[PDB]
Amino acid sequence: FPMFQGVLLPHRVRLLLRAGHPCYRPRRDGERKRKSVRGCIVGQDLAVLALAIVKQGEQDIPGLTDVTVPKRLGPKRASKIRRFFNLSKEDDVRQFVIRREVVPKKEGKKPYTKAPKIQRLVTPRTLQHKRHRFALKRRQAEKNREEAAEFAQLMAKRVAE
Amino acid sequence: ATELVVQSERAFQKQPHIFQNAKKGAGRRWYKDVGLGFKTPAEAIYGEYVDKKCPFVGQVSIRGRILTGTVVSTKMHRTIIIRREYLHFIPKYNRYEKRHKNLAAHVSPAFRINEGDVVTVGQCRPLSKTVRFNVLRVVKHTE
Amino acid sequence: VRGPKKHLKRVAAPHHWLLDKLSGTYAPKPSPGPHKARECLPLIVFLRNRLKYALNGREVKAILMQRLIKVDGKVRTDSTFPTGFMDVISVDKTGEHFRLVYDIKGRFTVHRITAEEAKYKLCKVKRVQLGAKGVPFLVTHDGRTIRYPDPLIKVNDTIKLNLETNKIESFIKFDTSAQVMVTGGRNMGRVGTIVHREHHLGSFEIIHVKDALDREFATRLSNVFVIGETGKSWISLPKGKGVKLSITEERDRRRALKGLA
Amino acid sequence: GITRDSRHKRSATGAKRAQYRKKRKFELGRQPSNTRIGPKRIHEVRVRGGNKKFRALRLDSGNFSWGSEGVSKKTRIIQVAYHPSNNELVRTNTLTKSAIVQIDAAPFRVWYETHYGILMGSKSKHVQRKHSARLGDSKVDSALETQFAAGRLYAVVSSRPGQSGRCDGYILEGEELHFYLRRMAPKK
RNA sequence: UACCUGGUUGAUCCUGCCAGUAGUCAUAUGCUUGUCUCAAAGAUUAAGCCAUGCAUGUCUAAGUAUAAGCAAGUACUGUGAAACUGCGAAUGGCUCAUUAAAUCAGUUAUCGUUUAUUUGAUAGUACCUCUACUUGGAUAACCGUGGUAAUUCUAGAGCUAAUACAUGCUAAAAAUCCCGACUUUUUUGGAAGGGAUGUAUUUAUUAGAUAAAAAACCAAUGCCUUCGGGCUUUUUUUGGUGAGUCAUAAUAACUUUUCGAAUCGCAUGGCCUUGCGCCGGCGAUGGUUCAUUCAAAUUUCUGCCCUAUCAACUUUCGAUGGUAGGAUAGAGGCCUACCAUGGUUUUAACGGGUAACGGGGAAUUAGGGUUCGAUUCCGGAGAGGGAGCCUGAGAAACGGCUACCACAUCCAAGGAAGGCAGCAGGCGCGCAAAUUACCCAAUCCCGACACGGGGAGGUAGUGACAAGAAAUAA
RNA sequence: CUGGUGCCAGCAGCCGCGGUAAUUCCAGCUCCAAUAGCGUAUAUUAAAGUUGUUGCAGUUAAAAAGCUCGUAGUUGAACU
RNA sequence: AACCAGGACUUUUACCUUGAAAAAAUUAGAGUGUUCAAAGCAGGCAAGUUUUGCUC
RNA sequence: GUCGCUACUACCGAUUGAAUGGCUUAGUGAGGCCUCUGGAUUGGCAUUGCCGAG
RNA sequence: GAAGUCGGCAAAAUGGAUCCGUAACUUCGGGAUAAGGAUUGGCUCUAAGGGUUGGACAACCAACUUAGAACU
C-alpha cells in the first residue's frame, strides 16, 4: 500500500480517492473509488523509502555521485527553445537542434538525424490562416452594413409610399 | 368572498412592476384581457385586490381547455370546488350511467360565488396540487 | 427513456417511406436537421429506394462521401440527412435536379426539374419578429432564418429563395384566390385554391380548398402550403397535379393503359 | 437526495400512493443556502443543462435603487429589518427576497447633493443654472427623510440571493414603506 | 361455423345439473414419426444461484510526438505501437418482480422549462492616455526504478507538446455620453483633448401610439422662415399572438465581466524601394446568442378485475386552500414559517386480494357477448434488496462508484474484493423450453471516421407440432 | 365372428356390461374416423335462452321482502 | 333607419350526418402467376434486331 | 335417528403460540452531498507576511 | 437477579404535569392513569387570547395565560 501525503495517522486508511489524487488513475472520467493508503509519518510498518538529496558528502559515493546521467528530451515550445540557447529575434533559431545518430536502425547509409517538431512558430501557413479569418470577418461586416443601408432605403421608400 | 382590507397578510401586497411617483398621482392599475371572448369584469378594472393567482390583474394566463360546471363547495379562500355531470356510455347494455368528477378552481374577488352559480372556467397552469383552472364566466342563479 | 433514442425500427418507420417489412429489422432513423423526423425523407432512402442509384449502405455512403449529391445547393455527406418537402437535391455529376414534392397519394415521389427552376425554393415562414438591435427576421418551415425581410411579409406567407445568394425574391400572401398544396393529413399532396377561411379562438383554423376539377375539401392551417397564384403554379407539379382520382377512377384508367402499352 | 416529486404525498382522496419508481435526477432538490451578512463568498454549482448557479453564502455591498429619481447605487448592507415569511430568518439575519434590510444612505445623499444642488437640512453660473432649472421636484417625503438623517435606509430585496448570487433591490416609499413601518413598529 | 346427444321415471311432459361434442403459438405428455418452405423457442415455479468466453469502442490529407519501432533533406516531411485529447459509453438487448387514476390509451398545454449533437443566421467593439505578437507552468507517452501471493494496484526520480489546462489589443475610419483647455446669448451655447458606450448577468424605471377628426395652455427644446412664433406628410421608434410585465429599445447602477479562434489541411497564383516583402481559392475542427431539429420533464378531459363479512378515509411528522420564502431547468404544499379547516365519498371514497406491466392485438364467431395479451411493435419499471453521488446536454447509470443487509469468493489470515432479468453454456426448482457454432455480407447504430467495432442483427445446428404443398405408386 | 376368466379379475368421461352362450373383460381376425398423425390431462370459448341489454325465471320445480312511508337512482300525460 | 349583400349566430345540449386530426404491424380487402398455397410487395415489355430504355 | 366402527374435512382451541413478509413504535446509526473550521505541500512577493488552491 | 423463603416477608423499582397510544371482557355506565412511549432546566424572543381611555382608529394605565422557536 503506498503512503499518501496528508494523513497524519501512521496506519493504512481507506478513503474516497479522486482523479486528481495520486496512486489512482480512474477508469472513467469523474469516477471516484475507495482504496487503502498509509499515513505520512514513517514508523515500523513501512517497507521501502524514497529520499531526495541536496548536498554531497565528504566521501564520494560511486553508485550515485561518481556516475552522471545526462538528459535526452530537449525543449519544444518556442519560448523554451529561445531561452535555452539565448537567441535574439533574428538569430536563425531554426538551425539550433541537437544532432543524434540513428544508424543502427538498419538505415544503412545517410545517417539521418531526426529532429523534433516545433510549435508556436511564425510559419507562413498561420499567417495565411490569420489573413483568411480577417478577410472573411471583414466581408461579413461589409455585407452586414450594406444590407443595413439597403433596408434603410427600402424602409424609407416604403414609408414614403 | 367578503371584501376585507387588501393588506391582510404578513407581507405587503402590491402588483409587480407597478410604480408610484410624484410627477404622476400615485401609480396606475394594470389589467389584461384573457382573450377567447371573455370580457374583463368592471370590478376587476376598478378594484383594490391583488390576487396574483387571477386571470385578470395578475400573471397567470388562460390556455388549454375551457370547462363549465356547478359550484358544490365554496368553503375555501379564493378557491372553490365545482362538479361536472356527464353520462358514461356502457356499450354492453347500450345504455348510459351518471358519472361525476369534482374539479377545483381559483376564483377572483370580482366574482361572487355561492352554491349553484354555474361557472365557466379555463385552464391556467397548476396553482396548488389540484387547481389548474380559473373562473372566467359566471351564470348567476339570482340575476 | 433515460436519454434520446438513436435506433428506429422497420415497421416503426413512416408508412410513406415504402420500406419492405422483411429484409431488415432497423430503419434509417433520420438525423436532426432542417425537417422533422416524421416529415422528412432520408438521403439514403432517396438514393436507394427511390432513385436506385445505390443498392447497399456501403454504396450510398460511397456516393455521398464522393461529394456529388448536393441539397439546397450545398453538398451533404450525411447518410440519414432529413431532406423534406421542397428540397432541391442537385446531382452535379450527371447533371440532374430533383424537387422533393408529395405524390398524388401524399408519398414522397421523384420529380425532376431542369437546371433552371432548380436555383430557387419556396418557404412558408413560421414566425416573423424583430430580434437583436431591433432588426427583423423570419424563420421558415425548414428551420431557415432570414434577416431584414419585406414589411409586407407576415405569418403564413410563402417566400422565394435563391440557395446561392439567399435574400427574398418574391413573396405570396395567404388569402383567397391563392394556389395552395396540402402537406398533411388525408389530403396531403393535393393542389387547389383557397376559397373560404374559418376562425377558431385558441384552436386550429380551417381552410377550404377547391381543386382544378371542381372538388372542395377542408384542411387545417398547419397542413396548407402556398405554392403560387391562380393559374400559375410557381413549382413544377408532378403527374396528377393533386386531383385525387378515386379508386374506381384509378381502376378504369389502369385497365385503359393496360394492353399494347 | 432531496425529492421534489408529487408521487410521495397522498392523493387528493387521502389515499397514499405506493412506490412506483426510484428517485430521479430530473426531480432533485438541494440544501437551502441560508446566506448571511458578511464578506462575499460565491460558489459555482453545476446545474442541469451544463449551466451554473451562483450559490451565495455571505453577501455585502448590494445594489439598491431609489425610484423617486430613478437612480440605482451600490450600497452596503447592514442587517435584515423584517422578514414577513418568518421572524426567525430576520432574527438570524439571513438575506432573501422581499426581506427588508438596512443600507447606507450616504451614497444617496451625496448623489442628491450633486444632482439637485440644494443642501439638505441646512460662482459657477453654469452649476447655478443647472441646479435652478430642475427645481420643483426637490421636495422629499419626511417619513423617509428621517431615515436619511438616521443614516440607514430601509430597502426591500427583489433578487434571489440563493439563485443569482446577487443582492439587488429597491428602497421603499409611500404606502409600501408606511405599511411595513406600521407592522414593525410594535415589534421593535 | 344462428346445429346437437345420453342420463332422475313402470311410462310421459318440464325445471334442473352431470356427461358427451367442436375450436384454441394453448401448454404438457403416451404411441408413432419419409420430404420441402416458413416461424417461434428457461415467460408460467426460484426478479433463484452461476464456472467459462464474449457482448463498446472509435483517426481522416486535415488535435497533440525524436518509442531507445520499421521499409526509406542537419524544425518534422512515409509508415507505425502506446499515450494524451474529443465523442460515445444514458443507444442497443433482456425480464415483467413492483405497480389499482398508478402504468397505459386517445386528446390538450408548456404565455410554467432544459437540451450536446444536425441546420440557418449571429461577432471590426476589450486594452494603452509605456500591452512580447505568436504566451506560462507541470504532465501523460518516454528513459531508469520499488513495494505487494494475487487485481485493469501504482508512488518516488528526470524531461517534453495540445483544439485539456491559465492569461491576453490583434481592425481601422468613425458618431453620442462622462471629465473639462474655454464658458452669455454665441437662437434654447457646447467643445479642443482623455475615456467608455461590443456583448452577457441582476435590479428599478420608461417608450412600447396607430377605426379615424376639430380645439384652450404650461417646462425641456428638433426645421428655422419673415421670432407673430409657426410648429407638418412626421423624428414622434418599431412587430406578433385569442390573451402577457411578450419581443425590441432606452434610462441609473452591479457583476470572483460568460463570449469576443494564441487551431489545422490541400493547391507556390500575382508583382517592385528586391526585402525572400505584400499576397490567393477550396475545406476541417472550436466558440457567444437566437431560432430549428433530435429528446426529456411536467400537464388538461375521459376510459381501468374482484371484494361492503372494507362505511367512512386524510388532517401528527401536510391532509384542503391562502400569504411569503427556499429548492428545482421550470409550474406546483416539493419543502419551510404563519393563517383559516378544509379535501374525497353508496355515481363506492378508504382498505384488501390480484394465482394484475398496460395497449395495438389474439382465440371463439349470426348479432350481442366471453376469455387471453409473459411474447417480433409503442410506452413504464428493473438490473439480489433499498439508499447516496461524480462525470456528462441527457444516469439516481449498476458490463460507473460509495455505504448497509442476504449470498458466494482467493487468503502468507495483513488484505482484495462481485452480481449473466445481456449472447452461448452450468446447478437447482421444475409437467414444461435448443449450440459454451459462424459472420459483420444484408438492416441500422456508435466513433476522430469512405476503411474500426457491434452475442444489435444476419447465417447455420437439435427438437415431434405453429403454419402451407404432396410421396407410400400405377 | 372364435379361444381364456367368470358380478372376480375388470372396464367404465354418462347410462351401463361382467353370477359359462361376455357384441362393453384379454388374445386372433375384419371394419370404422384421422393420417405423419392420433390420443390423454388441464385453462378458455361455443353449447349456456344455466348470467338473459339483445335474451332467463319467481302460484306449485331455486326465488315477491309481513305491510306502509319515502331520499339518492330510474321513469316520467298532451300541446308551441 | 330598413332595403340589399358579406363576417359571427347552439343560451346550453344529448342525438344523427359529415369533416379535420390521429403509428406501424393486425383484420377485411385492391392489384400482381412465390410453378399453387401459407407467402412477399414485388413487378411488366420483347420472342424477327436480344434491344446504352420505357411503363405501372 | 341413536350408539357401535373406519378414512377424511373444517372450526374453536388452553398452550399467557411462533414465524415469514410488509405497516408502524423508540433508540442507535454506516456512506455520499451541502455547510463551519481545518492547514503535509505548493503558491507572486536575499526580503516579508499578505489573495489564496489545498 | 427470587437460585432465599411455606410464601417476593422486607426492601427496591413506578410516581407530578404535557403530548401520543390503550386489549380481553362488560350490566355499555366501565375496565382506564389499562398496558406501552416521548418531553420537562436557564436565557432571549415570537404569535394569539381581555378591561377603562383623546381626537378608521389610541398614547397610556392596569393583567394573567397558552402555544411555538433559537441559543446555551
Nucleotides of I under 7 A from a protein CB: 45-47, 69-70
Q: Which long-range contacts (CB under 8 A, 24 or more apart) does A2-7 make?
A: A2/A37, A2/A38, A3/A37, A3/A38, A3/A39, A3/A40, A3/A42, A3/A46, A4/A37, A4/A38, A4/A39, A4/A40, A5/A40, A6/A40, A7/A37, A7/A38, A7/A39, A7/A40
Which of the 8 DSSP states describes residue A3? B
Q: Identify the residue whose cell numbers are 441646512.
A: D122
Q: In DSSP terms, which residues pair with C96 in a beta bridge? A: C91
Q: Which residues between 58 and 87 in chain B have a beta carbon less than 8 angstroms from any beta carbon of chain C?
A: 63
Experimental method: cryo-EM
Distance linking the first and last C-alpha atoms of chain A:
88
> Is the CB of B63 less than 8 angstroms away from the CB of C202?
yes
> Is the CB of A151 less than 8 angstroms away from the CB of C151?
no
Query: Max CA-CA distance within chain B?
Result: 74
CA dihedral C156, C157, C163, C165 (to 10 degrees): -130
- In 3D space, the residue among D63, D60, D65, D108 whose CA is nearest the CA of residue D80 turns out to be D60
- In 3D space, the residue among D70, D115, D134, D153 whose CA is nearest the CA of residue B19 turns out to be D70
The residue type found at C229 is E
d(Cα B96, Cα A108) in Å, to the nearest integer?
101
The HSE-up count of residue D141 (CA atoms within 13 Å, CB side) is 15
Please answer whether residues D140 and D119 qualify as being in contact, where contact means their C-beta atoms are separated by less than 8 angstroms. no
Round to a whole number and report the distance in Å from the CA of C109 to the C1' of I7. 110
Q: Which residue is nearest to nucleotide F54 (CA to C1')?
A: B93
d(Cα C154, Cα C174) in Å, to the nearest integer?
9
Please answer whether residues A74 and A82 qualify as being in contact, where contact means their C-beta atoms are separated by less than 8 angstroms. no
From residue D146, alpha-carbon distances to D96, D138, D142 in Å are 26, 16, 6
- In 3D space, the residue among D4, D80, D97, D88 whose CA is nearest the CA of residue D37 turns out to be D80
d(Cα C34, Cα C27) in Å, to the nearest integer?
20
d(Cα D155, Cα C70) in Å, to the nearest integer?
63
Q: Is the CB of residue A105 less than 8 Å away from at least one CB of chain C?
A: no
d(Cα B121, Cα B135) in Å, to the nearest integer?
4
Query: Max CA-CA distance within chain C?
Result: 68
d(Cα A147, Cα C149) in Å, to the nearest integer?
11
For residue C166 the three cell numbers come to: 439567399
B113's enclosing H/E stretch is: none
> Is the CB of B37 less than 8 angstroms away from the CB of C201?
yes
> Is the CB of A147 less than 8 angstroms away from the CB of C150?
no
Centre a 10 Å sphere on the Cβ of residue A47 and count the other Cβ atoms it contains.
5
The HSE-up count of residue A51 (CA atoms within 13 Å, CB side) is 4
Residues 6+ apart with CB under 8 A from B56: B31, B32, B34, B40, B41, B44, B108, B110
Ordered alpha helix ranges (H), chain D: 87-91, 106-116, 125-132, 142-150, 161-164, 175-187
Residue B81 in 3-state DSSP?
strand
Q: Is the CB of residue B25 less than 8 Å away from at least one CB of chain C?
A: no
d(Cα C176, Cα C193) in Å, to the nearest integer?
8
Please answer whether residues C233 and C212 qualify as being in contact, where contact means their C-beta atoms are separated by less than 8 angstroms. no
Give the residue from chain B lying closest to D69, CA to CA: B21
For residue D116 the three cell numbers come to: 439637485
Residues 6+ apart with CB under 8 A from C199: C205
With helix as H, strand as E and coil as C, how does chain C read?
CCCCCCCCCCCCCCHHHCCCCCCCCCCCCCCCCCCCCCCEEEHHHHHHHHCCCCCCHHHHHHHHHCCCEEECCEECCCCCCEEECCCEEEECCCCEEEECCECCCCCECCCEECCCCCCCCEEEEEEEEECHHHCEEEEECCCCEEECCCCCCCCCCEEECCCCCCCCCCEECCCCCEEEEECCHHHCCCEEEEEEECCCCCCCCEEEEECCCCCEEEEEHHHEEEEEECCEECCCCCCCCCCCCCHHHHHHHHHHHCCCC
- Test mutation, C148, C152, C165, C171, chain A, max A CBs within 10 A: C148
In degrees, rounded to 5, the angle at the alpha carbon of residue B81 between the alpha carbons of residues B80 and B82 is 120
- Test mutation, A151, A155, A157, chain C, max C CBs within 10 A: A151
Residue D184 in 3-state DSSP?
helix
Residues 6+ apart with CB under 8 A from B96: B87, B88, B89, B90
- In 3D space, the residue among C32, C14, C18 whose CA is nearest the CA of residue C82 turns out to be C32
Q: In DSSP terms, which residues pair with D156 in a beta bridge? A: D100, D170
Residue B129 in 3-state DSSP?
coil
Q: Do chains B and D touch (3 or more CB pairs under 8 A)?
A: yes
The minimum CA-CA distance between B47 and chain C, rounded to whole Å, is 28
Dihedrals phi, psi of D178, to nearest 5 degrees: -65, -40
d(Cα B51, Cα B57) in Å, to the nearest integer?
8
Q: In DSSP terms, which residues pair with C71 in a beta bridge? A: C74, C89
Centre a 10 Å sphere on the Cβ of residue A45 and count the other Cβ atoms it contains.
12
Dihedrals phi, psi of D88, to nearest 5 degrees: -65, -40
- Test mutation, B12, B20, B73, chain D, max D CBs within 10 A: B12
Q: Which residues between 135 and 154 in chain A have a beta carbon less than 8 angstroms from any beta carbon of chain C?
A: 147-148, 150-151, 154
Please answer whether residues C77 and C64 qualify as being in contact, where contact means their C-beta atoms are separated by less than 8 angstroms. yes
Residue B53 in 3-state DSSP?
coil
Residue D130 in 3-state DSSP?
helix
d(Cα D114, Cα C8) in Å, to the nearest integer?
70
Strands C145-147 and D28-29: unpaired
Which of the 8 DSSP states describes residue D165? S
Residues 6+ apart with CB under 8 A from C122: C86, C158, C159, C160, C161, C172, C226, C227, C234, C235
Please answer whether residues D62 and D80 qualify as being in contact, where contact means their C-beta atoms are separated by less than 8 angstroms. no
Query: Measured in whole angstroms, how far is the alpha carbon of residue A84 from the centre of its chain?
Result: 17
Q: Which long-range contacts (CB under 8 A, 24 or more apart) does B16-25 make?
A: B16/B52, B16/B59, B19/D67, B20/D173, B20/D174, B20/D175, B21/D67, B21/D68, B22/D68, B22/D137, B22/D139, B23/D137
How would you class C126 by CB atoms within 10 Å of its CB: exposed for 0-12, middle for 13-18, buried for 19 or more?
A: middle
Round to a whole number and report the distance in Å from the CA of C109 to the C1' of F71. 69
Round to a whole number and report the distance in Å from the CA of A121 to the C1' of E78. 24
The minimum CA-CA distance between C201 and chain B, rounded to whole Å, is 6
Residues 6+ apart with CB under 8 A from A113: A99, A100, A101, A102
- In 3D space, the residue among B40, B31, B7 whose CA is nearest the CA of residue B110 turns out to be B40
d(Cα B47, Cα D93) in Å, to the nearest integer?
37
Which of the 8 DSSP states describes residue D89? H
Q: Is the CB of residue B33 less than 8 Å away from at least one CB of chain C?
A: no
With helix as H, strand as E and coil as C, how does D26-42 read?
HHEECCCCCCEECCCEE
Q: Which long-range contacts (CB under 8 A, 24 or more apart) does B7-12 make?
A: B7/D179, B9/D84, B10/D84, B10/D85, B10/D183, B11/D84, B11/D85, B11/D98, B12/D84, B12/D176, B12/D179, B12/D180
Please answer whether residues C17 and C33 qualify as being in contact, where contact means their C-beta atoms are separated by less than 8 angstroms. no
Residue D110 in 3-state DSSP?
helix
- In 3D space, the residue among C27, C25, C32 whose CA is nearest the CA of residue C44 turns out to be C27
For residue C141 the three cell numbers come to: 418551415
Distance linking the first and last C-alpha atoms of chain B:
18
For residue C152 the three cell numbers come to: 409586407
A83's enclosing H/E stretch is: helix A78-85
Set of chain D residues whose Cβ sits within 8 Å of the Cβ of B25: none
d(Cα A81, Cα A115) in Å, to the nearest integer?
13
Q: Is the CB of residue C199 less than 8 Å away from at least one CB of chain B?
A: no
Please answer whether residues C204 and C220 qualify as being in contact, where contact means their C-beta atoms are separated by less than 8 angstroms. yes
In degrees, rounded to 5, the angle at the alpha carbon of residue C125 between the alpha carbons of residues C121 and C127 is 155
How would you class C156 by CB atoms within 10 Å of its CB: exposed for 0-12, middle for 13-18, buried for 19 or more?
A: buried
Q: Identify the residue whose cell numbers are 416524421.
A: C38
Query: Which of B9, B14, B21 has the CB atom closest to D176's CB atom?
Result: B14
Q: Is the CB of residue C150 less than 8 Å away from at least one CB of chain A?
A: yes
Please answer whether residues D107 and D73 qualify as being in contact, where contact means their C-beta atoms are separated by less than 8 angstroms. yes
For residue B123 the three cell numbers come to: 385552464
Set of chain B residues whose Cβ sits within 8 Å of the Cβ of C201: 35-37
d(Cα B47, Cα B27) in Å, to the nearest integer?
14
**Where are the strands (E) in chain A, listed by range?**
13-17, 33-37
Radius of gyration of chain A (CA): 31
Centre a 10 Å sphere on the Cβ of residue C113 and count the other Cβ atoms it contains.
18
Q: Which residue is nearest to nucleotide E403 (CA to C1')?
A: A34
d(Cα B51, Cα B134) in Å, to the nearest integer?
12
From residue A43, alpha-carbon distances to A10, A38, A46, A157 in Å are 7, 11, 6, 92
D156's enclosing H/E stretch is: strand D152-157
For residue D36 the three cell numbers come to: 448571511
Which residues precede chain breaks (C–N over 2.5 Å) in chain C?
none
For residue A102 the three cell numbers come to: 540513428
Radius of gyration of chain D (CA): 22
For residue A6 the three cell numbers come to: 496528508
In degrees, rounded to 5, the angle at the alpha carbon of residue A44 between the alpha carbons of residues A38 and A48 is 65
Residues 6+ apart with CB under 8 A from C217: C187, C190, C192, C208, C209, C211
- Test mutation, D179, D184, D187, chain B, max B CBs within 10 A: D179
How is chain A split among helix, strand and coil, in percent rounded to 5?
30, 5, 60
The minimum CA-CA distance between C196 and chain A, rounded to whole Å, is 31
Sign of the CA dihedral C161, C119, C101, C48?
A: negative
Set of chain D residues whose Cβ sits within 8 Å of the Cβ of B10: 84-85, 183
Centre a 10 Å sphere on the Cβ of residue C45 and count the other Cβ atoms it contains.
23
Residue A126 in 3-state DSSP?
helix
Other chains touching C, judged by 3 or more CB pairs under 8 Å: A, B
Round to a whole number and report the distance in Å from the CA of C24 to the C1' of E433. 27
In degrees, rounded to 5, the angle at the alpha carbon of residue A91 between the alpha carbons of residues A90 and A97 is 135
